[PDB]
Structure formats: structure tokens, C-alpha cells
Enzyme design. Structure first.
Site, PDB file in Angstrom:
ATOM      1  N   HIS A 184      76.506 113.069  -4.856  1.00 45.60           N
ATOM      2  CA  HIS A 184      75.173 113.054  -4.347  1.00 45.60           C
ATOM      3  C   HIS A 184      74.939 113.802  -2.996  1.00 45.60           C
ATOM      4  CE1 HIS A 184      76.013 109.327  -2.320  1.00 45.60           C
ATOM      5  NE2 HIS A 184      75.078 109.541  -1.495  1.00 45.60           N
ATOM      6  N   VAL A 187      79.195 115.587  20.634  1.00 49.74           N
ATOM      7  CA  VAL A 187      80.158 116.215  22.073  1.00 49.74           C
ATOM      8  C   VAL A 187      81.557 116.963  21.466  1.00 49.74           C
ATOM      9  CG1 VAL A 187      81.180 115.547  24.252  1.00 49.74           C
ATOM     10  CG2 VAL A 187      79.342 114.403  23.456  1.00 49.74           C
ATOM     11  N   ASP A 226      80.196 109.648  -9.049  1.00 48.06           N
ATOM     12  CA  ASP A 226      79.737 110.179  -7.938  1.00 48.06           C
ATOM     13  C   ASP A 226      80.736 110.635  -7.256  1.00 48.06           C
ATOM     14  OD1 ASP A 226      78.278 110.819  -5.893  1.00 48.06           O
ATOM     15  OD2 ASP A 226      77.560 108.866  -5.310  1.00 48.06           O
ATOM     16  N   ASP A 230      78.334  96.131   6.113  1.00 53.29           N
ATOM     17  CA  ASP A 230      78.218  97.063   4.741  1.00 53.29           C
ATOM     18  C   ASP A 230      78.240  98.165   5.355  1.00 53.29           C
ATOM     19  OD1 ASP A 230      75.708  97.171   2.082  1.00 53.29           O
ATOM     20  OD2 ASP A 230      77.802  98.141   2.159  1.00 53.29           O
ATOM     21  N   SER A 231      78.489  99.391   4.287  1.00 51.73           N
ATOM     22  CA  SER A 231      78.255 100.468   4.705  1.00 51.73           C
ATOM     23  C   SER A 231      76.805 101.034   4.584  1.00 51.73           C
ATOM     24  CB  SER A 231      79.140 101.576   3.755  1.00 51.73           C
ATOM     25  OG  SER A 231      78.929 101.479   2.495  1.00 51.73           O
ATOM     26  N   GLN A 244      73.309 104.425   4.996  1.00 50.00           N
ATOM     27  CA  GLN A 244      72.770 105.581   5.036  1.00 50.00           C
ATOM     28  C   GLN A 244      73.679 106.349   6.066  1.00 50.00           C
ATOM     29  OE1 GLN A 244      70.849 109.179   5.218  1.00 50.00           O
ATOM     30  NE2 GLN A 244      71.254 107.905   7.006  1.00 50.00           N
ATOM     31  N   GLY A 245      74.340 107.366   5.512  1.00 52.82           N
ATOM     32  CA  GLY A 245      74.911 108.385   6.482  1.00 52.82           C
ATOM     33  C   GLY A 245      76.245 108.240   6.260  1.00 52.82           C
ATOM     34  N   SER A 273      77.685 107.839   3.357  1.00 51.47           N
ATOM     35  CA  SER A 273      77.998 108.294   2.040  1.00 51.47           C
ATOM     36  C   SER A 273      78.913 109.547   1.978  1.00 51.47           C
ATOM     37  CB  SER A 273      76.576 108.817   1.350  1.00 51.47           C
ATOM     38  OG  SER A 273      75.566 107.719   1.071  1.00 51.47           O
ATOM     39  N   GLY A 274      79.838 109.305   0.939  1.00 56.74           N
ATOM     40  CA  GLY A 274      80.813 110.484   0.662  1.00 56.74           C
ATOM     41  C   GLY A 274      81.930 109.861   1.654  1.00 56.74           C
TER      42      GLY A 274
HETATM   43  C1  LIG Z   1      68.794 105.892   1.121  1.00 55.52           C
HETATM   44  O1  LIG Z   1      68.725 104.819   2.177  1.00 55.52           O
HETATM   45  C2  LIG Z   1      69.535 103.672   2.716  1.00 55.52           C
HETATM   46  O2  LIG Z   1      69.165 102.846   3.503  1.00 55.52           O
HETATM   47  C3  LIG Z   1      70.606 103.158   1.667  1.00 55.52           C
HETATM   48  C4  LIG Z   1      71.687 104.218   1.852  1.00 55.52           C
HETATM   49  C5  LIG Z   1      73.274 103.687   1.567  1.00 55.52           C
HETATM   50  C6  LIG Z   1      73.968 104.656   0.816  1.00 55.52           C
HETATM   51  C7  LIG Z   1      75.469 104.237   0.430  1.00 55.52           C
HETATM   52  C8  LIG Z   1      75.812 102.936   0.621  1.00 55.52           C
HETATM   53  C9  LIG Z   1      74.956 101.984   1.214  1.00 55.52           C
HETATM   54  C10 LIG Z   1      75.268 100.695   1.005  1.00 55.52           C
HETATM   55  N1  LIG Z   1      74.660  99.571   1.189  1.00 55.52           N
HETATM   56  N2  LIG Z   1      76.446 100.247   0.936  1.00 55.52           N
HETATM   57  C11 LIG Z   1      73.605 102.414   1.410  1.00 55.52           C
HETATM   58  N3  LIG Z   1      70.393 103.088   0.099  1.00 55.52           N
HETATM   59  C12 LIG Z   1      69.494 102.481  -0.283  1.00 55.52           C
HETATM   60  O3  LIG Z   1      68.733 101.636   0.172  1.00 55.52           O
HETATM   61  C13 LIG Z   1      69.020 102.557  -1.941  1.00 55.52           C
HETATM   62  N4  LIG Z   1      68.537 101.593  -2.501  1.00 55.52           N
HETATM   63  S1  LIG Z   1      66.953 101.624  -3.079  1.00 55.52           S
HETATM   64  O4  LIG Z   1      66.765 100.325  -4.053  1.00 55.52           O
HETATM   65  O5  LIG Z   1      66.063 101.707  -2.057  1.00 55.52           O
HETATM   66  C14 LIG Z   1      66.795 103.353  -3.963  1.00 55.52           C
HETATM   67  C15 LIG Z   1      67.659 103.282  -5.276  1.00 55.52           C
HETATM   68  C16 LIG Z   1      67.353 104.589  -5.825  1.00 55.52           C
HETATM   69  C17 LIG Z   1      66.543 105.522  -5.421  1.00 55.52           C
HETATM   70  C18 LIG Z   1      66.319 106.970  -5.907  1.00 55.52           C
HETATM   71  C19 LIG Z   1      66.148 105.578  -3.956  1.00 55.52           C
HETATM   72  C20 LIG Z   1      66.117 104.141  -3.325  1.00 55.52           C
HETATM   73 CA   LIG Z   2      82.990 116.080  18.497  1.00 57.12          CA
END
Ligand SMILES: COC(=O)[C@H](Cc1cccc(C(=N)N)c1)NC(=O)CNS(=O)(=O)c1ccc(C)cc1
Ligand SMILES: [Ca+2]
Length: 223
Positions: free
Chosen positions: A40, A57, A84, A171-172, A174-175, A177-178
Site C-alpha cells: 500500500h 537534517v 500487503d 502502537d505503530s 501513520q507514517g 507503514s512499510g
Molecule cells: C491512515 O491514518 C491513520 O492514522 C492510521 C495509520 C496506520 C498505518 C499502519 C498501522 C497503524 C496501526 N495502528 N498500527 C496505523 N490508520 C487508520 O486509522 C486506518 N483505520 S480506519 O478505520 O480509519 C480506515 C480503514 C480503511 C480506509 C480506506 C480508511 C480508514
Molecule cells: Ca538525515
């Protein structure tokens, strides 16, 4: 990463930052010319950044190399996030050293209860947003499939596993990912998805790498 700690400059040498004008995803170096990340996270015009700590930096141990080819798993389903995983070949082999090293692929699957290290430059807040410039780390155990399905009710496939705390707080996010999930010195998972971040009874879901070793090896051997 929410509720984690500052790793320390270059203490996680296999961590890479995928940059397209800005950091957008994490990744793991599995050898001098290949990186593994989440499907993704796919995007064209990716530059891989190795030896990074503060991503804003230039500190002196970085290696910026463009990707020459990206390979998303043949069975990746963007709706369920099943499979994924994606491979990225570098235009040139990176120079491996103490700050830039590869992580080995697993020979067996990790069991629930195993402690693992998760890292990334993702959001550090469970509510609101705050992005760190330095690498954050988190120690988290692999949860049993039963305890997970029972809590999130979400759909978890055989190619996924939950890791974290059901009480939330760590927890992990946004950002991240991967990014890598390392257990016993081997890459066991990839930061994939979750419902919000660090929410109670909503642990992170990760791609189960041990199921893709054959694919990874074969792909790297012919590309
Ligand atoms: C996308 O924004 C976010 O704050 C997190 C990111 C994320 C990514 C990887 C791992 C974690 C983690 N918690 N370990 C979090 N995901 C969400 O909050 C997604 N949940 S969701 O229920 O908001 C959702 C599901 C599907 C779509 C298309 C859009 C939104
Ligand atoms: Ca650097």
C-alpha cells in the site's frame, strides 16, 4: 510510533525511509540492492534513504539511492490489505557498513508471545498529530490470532498477525507503514494497517513475512 522511545542514531541500520519529496513510508533493507516494504506504500518516483536518523537534517551517514523497479505482490488486495508486501530494487547497491546493514529473512514463523522491535518516523500521537524527525522504537509482543480476532472483530487473514497491547497506548501509526517488525534478529513483519492508533482493543496488524520468503527469494533471483 505511539508510546515508544527514541531508538538512537543508526541503532536500527536496516531501517529505510521511502521518500518522494518527503518521507511517506518505512522499509527494510534485505540486501545491498533490495528493500521490502508494504504494497500500500507503492508509488512511482521513489528514492530510498538509508542510514537515516533525523530525516530533516543531513547528518553524514546517509545514502540516497533511487529505485529502478518496484514489485507489488501478485495477489495484493488493496481492500483487505491481504498480501500487503512489495519489493523495491535499488538503481545501485548500497554500501553496507555499521550504520547501513541488511536484516535477515526468517526461516520459521514467530509465535505469539515473542517480543519484537518495531520502528519508524510515523505519528507519535493517538489523538491529533505530531511527527518526530528522529527514529522511534517500540517493543511489542506478537498476539495470538484468537485474542486478536476476538478483540478487533476486523478481518485478519493467515498472511497477517497482530502485535501490540490490547490496553492501547503503544502502537505503530501513520507514517510507520512499510516499516520493520523484527523478532529474534529476523524480519518477521511489515507495518501494514490498524484502526486509528494505540486505541484500546485495536492492536496493529502486520504482514506475516515468513509466508513470503519463497516469493521474495525467487523474485530477487530473477530481477
Ligand atoms: C491512515 O491514518 C491513520 O492514522 C492510521 C495509520 C496506520 C498505518 C499502519 C498501522 C497503524 C496501526 N495502528 N498500527 C496505523 N490508520 C487508520 O486509522 C486506518 N483505520 S480506519 O478505520 O480509519 C480506515 C480503514 C480503511 C480506509 C480506506 C480508511 C480508514
Ligand atoms: Ca538525515
Amino acid at each position: 510510533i505511539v508510546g515508544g522511545y527514541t531508538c538512537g542514531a543508526n541503532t536500527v541500520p536496516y531501517q529505510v525511509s521511502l521518500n518522494s519529496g518527503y518521507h511517506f513510508c518505512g522499509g527494510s533493507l534485505i540486501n545491498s540492492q533490495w528493500v521490502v516494504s508494504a504494497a500500500h506504500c507503492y508509488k512511482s518516483g521513489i528514492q530510498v534513504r538509508l542510514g537515516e536518523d533525523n530525516i530533516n537534517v543531513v547528518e553524514g551517514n546517509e545514502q540516497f539511492i533511487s529505485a529502478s523497479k518496484s514489485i507489488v505482490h501478485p495477489s495484493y488486495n488493496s481492500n483487505t490489505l491481504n498480501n500487503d508486501i512489495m519489493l523495491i530494487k535499488l538503481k545501485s547497491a548500497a554500501s553496507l557498513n555499521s550504520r547501513v546493514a541488511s536484516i535477515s529473512l526468517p526461516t520459521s514463523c514467530a509465535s505469539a508471545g515473542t517480543q519484537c522491535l518495531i520502528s519508524g518516523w510515523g505519528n507519535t500521537k493517538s489523538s491529533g498529530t505530531s511527527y518526530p524527525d528522529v527514529l522511534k522504537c517500540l517493543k511489542a509482543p506478537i498476539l495470538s490470532d484468537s485474542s486478536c480476532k476476538s478483540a478487533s472483530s476486523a478481518i485478519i487473514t493467515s498472511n497477517m498477525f497482530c502485535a501490540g497491547y490490547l490496553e492501547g497506548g503503544k502502537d505503530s501509526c501513520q507514517g510507520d507503514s512499510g516499516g520493520p517488525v523484527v523478532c529474534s534478529g529476523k524480519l518477521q513483519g511489515i507495518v501494514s494497517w490498524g484502526s486509528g492508533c494505540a486505541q484500546k482493543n485495536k492492536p496493529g496488524v502486520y504482514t506475516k513475512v515468513c509466508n513470503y520468503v519463497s516469493w521474495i527469494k525467487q523474485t530477487i533471483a530473477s530481477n
